[PDB]
Design a protein around this ligand. Structure first.
Ligand SMILES: COc1ccc2c(c1)[C@@H]1C[C@]1(C(=O)N1[C@@H]3CC[C@H]1CN(C)C3)Cn1c-2c(C2CCCCC2)c2ccc(C(=O)NS(=O)(=O)N(C)C)cc21
Ligand SMILES: CNC(=O)c1c(-c2ccc(F)cc2)oc2cc(NS(C)(=O)=O)c(OC(C)C)cc12
Ligand SMILES: CCCCCCCCO[C@@H]1O[C@H](CO)[C@@H](O)[C@H](O)[C@H]1O
Ligand SMILES: CCCCCCCCO[C@@H]1O[C@H](CO)[C@@H](O)[C@H](O)[C@H]1O
Length: 500
């Protein structure tokens, strides 16, 4: 029966509350220049004789064509807009050389001109509306450290906490026409410029609801930009879930939403009562056309909930105080890093894993040790690497890792010890399974890596001091690494990542 959507009073009530909050948002219509500057340098070429760089640093051909696309969006409210379907080759896969089928992910996008028009009309709404509507439930406002703080405080707030994760399997292609229209109705509640209001209506009717796809066919999958798709999915999932919490009569809910991924922390009503409540929640979500991947399970320990491939775990700082942090099973991070040891990638998953999971036993002992050893050998500590973290691609120098880690995780990230036996066992058994040397070997290797870094001075010695303080018996004190704004001077006089 594919997608069949049934909307009730709970859904309608939550939508009114969302629209009432949306009404307090005043969003601005970006000029051609403002939108052009937001174009990524490696954004796909237009079929109209220009393509990134030209748009990015303003060009007569690019700007005048994008102004005609804009005029057409304001004047035509129904003609379907075309989208291109392309195969982007896979990174962690054996790629045929001198003939063969190339493993690839498929990407669907409108012409570059349309993409800049979408930014003019929606960038300010997508970057302001979700937080204004969902508040603390909006998952993309948090750093790993702030996210864990939010979760733990929500868990501690309950008399008898219960929590569960709910994941909607492949929604990005299966997005209903209704969901797209409901999203638009929320965006329309903002204080928009009249041209924005029309452009939003045209884009939703001509592009977002569906349209033709070419190098052909017709698509009903998301053709919006990353920021637009993210906003849409999060608002839709929040709407359906907040309504489903009411239908399931869940008490004192705290939700955390990241696109299609969600977590609810509420008050337990007893084992069998909670099991019934979750069945109720799932029935409501399924009726709202958001069925689960795996049926949700009530959890009574925060550590047992897995969401966005991660779970909360405990460690202790140097003073013995409990420190909470996000971790994950290290099999895929290690397997991808093994690949990268043999072959250079444009993603540098190892570096992204060190940044996302810096407090973890496996990122500190294995990934930092192994890659600093390689960088020392190759004399490439200074070389900025392109690193993909979630959406974006960042250029990161390994020498700036202490500063980055402190910003995202806090100073405790460098002093953690007394990790949970279960967490250690997951790491240890994983090393045995993959043929990786045990943790005792990594300590020996890190003492040598730290020594070589210290001898190099500057940022290299700060990497030695902060990142490998776990490897020495006689530990250094470790004070916060000061930001350029704290020092009260320009980033030009501050080595590495300063505050830009
Ligand atoms: C499929 O999933 C995985 C996952 C992990 C590993 C492998 C495969 C690779 C099988 C192993 C291997 O033997 N390798 C050698 C060395 C590194 C890795 C990849 N490389 C292309 C060839 C076993 N093996 C893996 C890693 C990873 C390297 C990146 C950072 C994280 C650890 C190792 C790191 C050091 C040794 C280590 O030092 N082993 S040792 O002491 O027995 N010896 C000196 C080689 C062995 C490793
Ligand atoms: C809705 N779920 C969440 O927001 C997340 C949870 C979580 C895990 C267990 C729970 F019990 C509750 C939440 O863990 C995460 C880890 C990351 N990445 S990271 C490791 O880089 O921080 C994340 O960042 C991206 C997607 C923005 C979002 C979440
Ligand atoms: C160590 C475990 C991870 C695998 C590392 C090997 C990476 C495979 O990489 C492959 O190498 C071939 C030979 O140059 C190329 O022909 C392929 O295009 C490439 O995908
Ligand atoms: C795995 C992450 C679980 C998060 C638990 C947050 C609640 C912490 O709770 C604390 O636990 C301590 C345990 O020794 C007790 O001493 C404290 O009294 C209690 O408030």
């Amino acid at each position: 029966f594919d997608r069949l959507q049934v909307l009730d009073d709970h859904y309608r009530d939550v939508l009114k509350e969302m629209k009432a909050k949306a009404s307090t948002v005043k969003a601005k219509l970006l000029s051609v220049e403002e939108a052009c500057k937001l174009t990524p340098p490696h954004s796909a070429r237009s079929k109209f004789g220009y393509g990134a760089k030209d748009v990015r640093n303003l060009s007569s051909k690019a700007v005048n064509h994008i102004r005609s696309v804009w005029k057409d969006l304001l004047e035509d409210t129904e003609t379907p807009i075309d989208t291109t379907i392309m195969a982007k080759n896979e990174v962690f896969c054996v790629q045929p050389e001198k003939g063969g089928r190339k493993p690839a992910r498929l990407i669907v996008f409108p012409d570059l001109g349309v993409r800049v028009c979408e930014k003019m009309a929606l960038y300010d709404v997508v970057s302001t509306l979700p937080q204004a509507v969902m508040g603390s439930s909006y998952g993309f406002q948090y750093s790993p450290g702030q996210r864990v703080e939010f979760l733990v405080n929500a868990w501690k707030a309950k008399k008898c906490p219960m929590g569960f994760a709910y994941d909607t399997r492949c929604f990005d292609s299966t997005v209903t026409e209704n969901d797209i229209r409901v999203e638009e109705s929320i965006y329309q509640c903002c204080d928009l410029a009249p041209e924005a209001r029309q452009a939003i209506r045209s884009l939703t009717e001509r592009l977002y609801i569906g349209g033709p796809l070419t190098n052909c066919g017709y698509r009903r999958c998301r053709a919006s930009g990353v920021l637009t798709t993210s906003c849409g999915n999060t608002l839709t999932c929040y709407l359906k879930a907040a309504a489903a919490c009411r239908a399931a009569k869940l008490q004192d809910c705290t939700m955390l939403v990241c696109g299609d991924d969600l977590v609810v922390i509420c008050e337990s009503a007893g084992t069998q009562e909670d099991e019934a409540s979750l069945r109720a929640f799932t029935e409501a979500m399924t009726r709202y056309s958001a069925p689960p991947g795996d049926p949700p399970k009530p959890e009574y320990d925060l550590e047992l909930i897995t969401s966005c491939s991660s779970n909360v775990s405990v460690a202790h700082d140097a003073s013995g105080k409990r420190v909470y942090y996000l971790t994950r099973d290290p099999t895929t991070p290690l397997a991808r890093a093994a690949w990268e040891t043999a072959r250079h990638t444009p993603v540098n998953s190892w570096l992204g894993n060190i940044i996302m999971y810096a407090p973890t036993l496996w990122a500190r002992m294995i990934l930092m040790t192994h890659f600093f050893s390689i960088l020392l050998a190759q004399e490439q500590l200074e070389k900025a690497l392109d690193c993909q973290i979630y959406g974006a691609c960042y250029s990161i120098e390994p020498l700036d890792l202490p500063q980055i880690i402190q910003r995202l995780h806090g100073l405790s990230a460098f002093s953690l010890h007394s990790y949970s036996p279960g967490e250690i066992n997951r790491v240890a058994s994983c090393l045995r399974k993959l043929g990786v040397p045990p943790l005792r070997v990594w300590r020996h290797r890190a003492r040598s890596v730290r020594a070589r870094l210290l001898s190099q001075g500057g940022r290299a010695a700060t990497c030695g001091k902060y990142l490998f303080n776990w490897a020495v018996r006689t530990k250094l004190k470790l004070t916060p690494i000061p930001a350029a704004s704290q020092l009260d001077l320009s980033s030009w006089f501050v080595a590495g990542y300063s505050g830009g």
